[PDB]
Amino acid sequence: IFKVNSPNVVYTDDEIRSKYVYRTTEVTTAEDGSLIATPRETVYDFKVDRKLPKLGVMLVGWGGNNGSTITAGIIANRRGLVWETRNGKQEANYYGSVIMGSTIKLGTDAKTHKDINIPFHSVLPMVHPNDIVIGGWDISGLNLADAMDRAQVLEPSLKALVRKEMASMKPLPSIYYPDFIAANQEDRADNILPGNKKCWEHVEEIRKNIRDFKAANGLDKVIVLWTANTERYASIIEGVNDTADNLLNAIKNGHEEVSPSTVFAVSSILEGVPFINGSPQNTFVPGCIELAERHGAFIGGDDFKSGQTKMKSALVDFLINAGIKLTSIASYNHLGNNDGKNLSSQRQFRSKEISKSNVVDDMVEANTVLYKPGEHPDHIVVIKYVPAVGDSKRAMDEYHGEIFLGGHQTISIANVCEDSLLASPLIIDLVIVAELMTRIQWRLHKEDATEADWKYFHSVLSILSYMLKAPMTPPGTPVVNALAKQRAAMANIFRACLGLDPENDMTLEHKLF
Amino acid sequence: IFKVNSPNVVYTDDEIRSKYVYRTTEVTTAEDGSLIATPRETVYDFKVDRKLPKLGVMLVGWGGNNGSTITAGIIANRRGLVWETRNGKQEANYYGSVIMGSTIKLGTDAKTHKDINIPFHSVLPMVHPNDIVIGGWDISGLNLADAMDRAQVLEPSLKALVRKEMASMKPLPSIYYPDFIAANQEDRADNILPGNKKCWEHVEEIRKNIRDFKAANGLDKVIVLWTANTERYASIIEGVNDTADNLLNAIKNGHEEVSPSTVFAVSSILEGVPFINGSPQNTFVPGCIELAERHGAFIGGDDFKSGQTKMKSALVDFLINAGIKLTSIASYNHLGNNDGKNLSSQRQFRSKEISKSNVVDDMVEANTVLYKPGEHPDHIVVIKYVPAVGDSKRAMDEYHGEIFLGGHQTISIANVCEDSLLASPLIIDLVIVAELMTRIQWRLHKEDATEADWKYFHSVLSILSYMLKAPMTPPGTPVVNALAKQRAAMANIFRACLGLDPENDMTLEHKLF
Amino acid sequence: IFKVNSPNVVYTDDEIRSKYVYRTTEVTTAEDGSLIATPRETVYDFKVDRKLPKLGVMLVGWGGNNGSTITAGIIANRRGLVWETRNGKQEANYYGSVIMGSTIKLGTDAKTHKDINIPFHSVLPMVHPNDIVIGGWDISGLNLADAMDRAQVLEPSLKALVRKEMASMKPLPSIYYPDFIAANQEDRADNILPGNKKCWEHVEEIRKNIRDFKAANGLDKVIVLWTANTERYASIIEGVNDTADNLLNAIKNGHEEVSPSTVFAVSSILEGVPFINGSPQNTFVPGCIELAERHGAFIGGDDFKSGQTKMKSALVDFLINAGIKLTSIASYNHLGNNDGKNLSSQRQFRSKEISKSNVVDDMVEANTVLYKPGEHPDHIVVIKYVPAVGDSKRAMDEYHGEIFLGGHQTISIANVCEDSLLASPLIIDLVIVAELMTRIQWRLHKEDATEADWKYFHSVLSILSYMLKAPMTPPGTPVVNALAKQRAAMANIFRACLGLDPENDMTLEHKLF
Ligand SMILES: NC(=O)c1ccc[n+]([C@@H]2O[C@H](COP(=O)([O-])OP(=O)(O)OC[C@H]3O[C@@H](n4cnc5c(N)ncnc54)[C@H](O)[C@@H]3O)[C@@H](O)[C@H]2O)c1
Ligand SMILES: NC(=O)c1ccc[n+]([C@@H]2O[C@H](COP(=O)([O-])OP(=O)(O)OC[C@H]3O[C@@H](n4cnc5c(N)ncnc54)[C@H](O)[C@@H]3O)[C@@H](O)[C@H]2O)c1
Ligand SMILES: NC(=O)c1ccc[n+]([C@@H]2O[C@H](COP(=O)([O-])OP(=O)(O)OC[C@H]3O[C@@H](n4cnc5c(N)ncnc54)[C@H](O)[C@@H]3O)[C@@H](O)[C@H]2O)c1
């Protein structure tokens, strides 16, 4: 633990009221066409609620690969289970999680002159993942022990320990619209609500399920996470999905271009729970976003940045920030789970391909020294279904680049990654950060500020962009896709609630003496 | 171009006098063992000399692979030469250079709400690489056109254009101490000064050469860069190399444990020119550093971070900052130039292995959540001599990591990199940044400050750490090895001389509205 | 099953007496320097003993990685055990074995015109691996269940089934000469016979152990296989190891340059059991071979061709037989078992490096169109100890080649191979083929041949060369290292005992009609 010694930071047993000075640079164009840089300061008052709630996560796709892996891993970490591998004994951990497995720099030691590093989870009052309750919906009624055996992700020794408690968990019936997921997912749907079309009864039932989850479990806050199959893009039609009331009427009129995910998101917005989409499909259409802003409900980005895309975000940033001109990026993946079986259809593969292909455009528009306006590298993404490899995704990347005097650099990467074991800690990170963001309020520093001036963060949580492949940002704002930039954004926003200045890495006390 | 509109920044035609507030966090231990974080502010006055000098670089190892590549590339960029490749026409560029091929963010647009990115070279008044004069010493008297043909790095079409002017360049005689480089480099030395041992006449001759370079060329500033063969570690002996006067006496007494690089560095310190070591050997012993601090001469780090080590700095940082526990790093390189031939000896390979192996220790000591005190991954580095591959170094990396619930991640990387084409822009970056650092002065902001209170940066230039594999820091300070951290340090130090605040990446104007 | 309908093949319930015509080509130099090719025919009589013996294998290094894996796998296949993996249910098999997992072509169908393929194990009367008895010596007294847990090769579910029967197996004490294996293997030796030097009592004890194994178990034939640590090369000294009697005197005189493996081989030759060396060290010195020929004892080659070397034998053959000039071969391996720990010493790594480096010389001497006399590619082999990877050896190969008009081909291979699971079926293959070779006799076809003219194959079994990295051939004969050639040799020699002609692959009945 640590505390901040500053007149600007006031600690109360319920609140961490703090004063912060946001310092930025504003650029305006001069008369002769040159740029003028002006330092700007905005004084902000931040309020952080110290009380930790009893948090529940509702998973849409509970019986999937990722959902079963999560519920098993939370049980394993909560009980401190030790199991047997060929190498010997294995203990439960939260590796692969930036919040639960990484540290950030607090400051420099006065005496030793060395850096003080504290866990990322300990910066702000945050909910511990061991106490997270899981539930939700699935079109397949298989219990989560049998779902665990279907997934083929976990070792038999661990499954033996977690099977007794995971056999009592059965997902609630969900909604199946046949048009949106692949034709080979017909035989999977046995636990489905009455109706293959879009209706207002589905919204009522989903709201009832969220209510009953919170009531029966005894939870203070609920979060809904979409971990279901990738869907096809729902066409944007004027009068159907372009406005909150238009969409609310389209649900009742039973229009044939409303995704199941949109029904879940609408139910979440009407019940006041945050909704995070873990799939590349366009769950939030114009009208879902406006309904979220009209009600004050928090909504997150799309997809999960776990594996080849995370390393791509690191590498493209590193290579373009070093002066190497990337001309080709070729991503090849083949996998043999139900995720790859659903993406074997073109209409459902297109969404994932679009999500994977749009991670490098911001980095190539930032480097105007290498890339001319309109110059983009050849970015190809291929995903194939190989049933024999199972959950072990094999990714092959070829990065082709141009260097000094026309030289050629080629970087070939072979990644053997367990998909579910790389996305589960991301879900933990998403829920923990979203719960924290529901507990932070802000206002402008005035000499007569009242309690009525407290405001929340914008309904679209871009602070989750570290864990999201296709970040969703507030309407009209740019998108940040660099991994280091997103991690720094999260860390510095967390430090701003403590009145601490952002990390600059200059270290002038070691250079000027 | 751009200008800063701020009362703290005053622009004169010769100076950029600016006022900056260095904001950091200081950590002190409380009585009950907890940590206390206190915001600290140090007010600094920075003075930047706007006048650009005529800069000359003296290369020790001019006829090597890297030196010939540099002199050819500077000619190619200066003349704007276009040559023929199989793919068609190729123009000269400075790709692979962070200063000449990358951009940094200046600020946000007032109207568009989009980011303004300006070239890294345009942030501060900096010397253009097209105007850099080259010269120096080599033990081989071959002219640099024949040295270019010996190197086997450049295409015949480019060599045809640059051969006429590169055949008039002949390196000055150098000093050859047989004990320090490999036994297979005996036949290479034909241009050597009289003497196989350490003497004060060598210092006189090297100082004379630096003087004559500056006088004949008409230069305002000179920088010496060691681009010669990797040397063996010179033993630290009390009374020989532990003190500036002890070392100055050891040169005259002709002790047998003084490297040729130490003679070059001593000559540079006595003539007031900066010296940058581009090799893993310990050029600066205790006594060379003290002589540098006693005279005010600037000295740089060791080795060149070009290729597998740069990507290692990116990847290890990315993986450990994401919660993945690296257990094994295995670097394999084989190459067939004179660099690999000199490293075929164990005593000269040890220095490069030590330099390559110490890039990840700071990242594993920062993450106390994953690594216990004393826990280090298995880091192996292998370098082999394969004459058939030439300058094209083939690097194979295996990163083995532990992830959620005991999962295994393996990342296999095959890099085919032209060594000389990845290190030449690094040399340009080093000389440009070092020249700029010779033009920056600092002081503490007082109400009665005088002109006599202006001070330079510390003699050990750690701001070059981005381009250096084994960064040398001021005595008693920690070492930063993360690539993103070093680039951010350079950018934020450059912005501090303009009175601008460091980049925080928070973007609160897009989240709070 | 199948039978041969031919007057040349006579089937008896105990013998398969057959007549074969060995057809080859002989080359003699003409007067004008040209070559003359003459067809030669040698008529051979082959006798194959149909009776299958009760076979026992004695392993030197029983408690090692490979020995424990073998004894466990034989139990698993014998009992037909099914265990649990993450993917589901796994049954026992003999995959990775050329005899037990591959087929050979018997002939063409008269009616269908399609090929008839029969299992390699069914060509000749051969011992089934399910009935093989295991035993032997080890310097470590740990039982083989605890040795199995030490090895970290097998899944916990399989180990649970095999642990009860593998805990009753304890290796006999062995002989430890400290000079020959690495200094870090001191603490491993607790089950050692009295004596750190070479003595005749060791031969008596080893012979007693072989006798008692056969007597107690009730076996008809015994084979000894060296699966112990790699040793250093024993110097060839005149009067010590250059003659059978010289070596027999050197054992008694206690010379300090006689390997432990030589003592085992000598004991085997004096007891009449075959000895196969599975390590790169020179077990058979001049004098051991002569003793083998003087007694009639069978001795095999050196090392195990399992993994990167097998693929190297395939690839180098394929590339050089296709017209591609290999200029560089770079093999990198790192592993973390006791094998890699013993090879961390230079004197013990040299033997493995020599064994791995000499697999391509025969292929480059066969292609006189590409390689001039004395032209050899750059062949580098690196083996490193990385304790974190365990038995999973990571091999990285770079094959660099020259193609049409000076083009460059590069082939980069990343192999993740379980070392013990690739060498265990090789040991099964070696013992099965060696037992068969002890049951085959030959003679020249004469009109008055008697029973006294029956002869055995030469004491040095080169027919095992498929499974051996460093093939040992009869003194004065060339070595075959191509994998396809060795497999074809084995198949055609097996078919020659059946009176069948070698496979030619011409298929003229489908081309001439
Ligand atoms: N590395 C990763 O695992 C990763 C990374 C990025 C994105 N994603 C995305 O996350 C999602 C989950 O991946 P997975 O491998 O766990 O999936 P999966 O293939 O196991 O299927 C998800 C589950 O959702 C269920 N489902 C489908 N439609 C439903 C509906 N309308 N209501 C309720 N349940 C429904 C399916 O029956 C299935 O059990 C996918 O969309 C995938 O594309 C995964
Ligand atoms: N990617 C890279 O190229 C890279 C990266 C990191 C470090 N380095 C280091 O940079 C240096 C230059 O590499 P290179 O491939 O150009 O080297 P190289 O093999 O071509 O040899 C450098 C030159 O220095 C000369 N030399 C040696 N001792 C000398 C002395 N006392 N005085 C004058 N000249 C002397 C040699 O004759 C040779 O011509 C090496 O030490 C190398 O280890 C290179
Ligand atoms: N893929 C492979 O596994 C492979 C391939 C080629 C060659 N080999 C060779 O096969 C051998 C076995 O490999 P491993 O990984 O099973 O070995 P290992 O590292 O497990 O050690 C072999 C065993 O032999 C024992 N031993 C050593 N000296 C002995 C002696 N004098 N008498 C009795 N026991 C003795 C050791 O204590 C150890 O238990 C090694 O020499 C290895 O180099 C293995």
Author numbering:
A (entry chain A), B (entry chain A), C (entry chain A): 40 to 552
Which of the paper's sentences describe this entry?
In the first step of the reaction, glucose-6-phosphate (G6P) is converted to myo-inositol-1-phosphate (IMP) by myo-inositol-1-phosphate synthase (MIPS) and subsequently dephosphorylated. The fungal MIPS from the thermophile, as its mesophilic counterparts, forms a homotetramer, with dimensions of 120 Å by 100 Å, highlighting that the overall stoichiometry is conserved. Overall, the higher-order organization of fungal MIPS is in line with previously determined orthologous structures, featuring an extensive β-sheet network at a horizontal dimerization interface, a highly conserved NAD+ binding domain and an extensive vertical central domain connecting the monomers.
We utilized a minimal purification approach to capture the endogenous MIPS, preserving elements of cellular organization, and rendering the sample suitable for structural characterization. In the final reconstruction of the endogenous complex, we were able to resolve residues 40 to 552, which overall reveal a high conservation among all structurally determined MIPS orthologues. Residues 380 to 400, guarding the entry to the active site appeared to be in a folded state, showing clear α-helical morphology. In the asymmetric reconstruction of the complex, we observed persistent densities for NAD, illustrating that NAD occupies all four active sites simultaneously—i.e., MIPS is endogenously NAD saturated. To evaluate NAD dissociation, we analyzed PDB-deposited structures of eukaryotic and prokaryotic MIPS and could not establish any link between NAD binding and active site conformation changes, supporting our hypothesis that NAD is tightly bound within the active site and does not dissociate during reaction cycles in the active endogenous purification. This hypothesis is also substantiated by the observation that NAD does not dissociate during biochemical treatment of the cell extract and is present in our reconstructions with full occupancy. State 1 (S1) is characterized by a folded helical domain (23%), whereas this domain is absent in state 2 (S2) (69%), possibly due to unfolding, and backfolded in state 3 (8%).
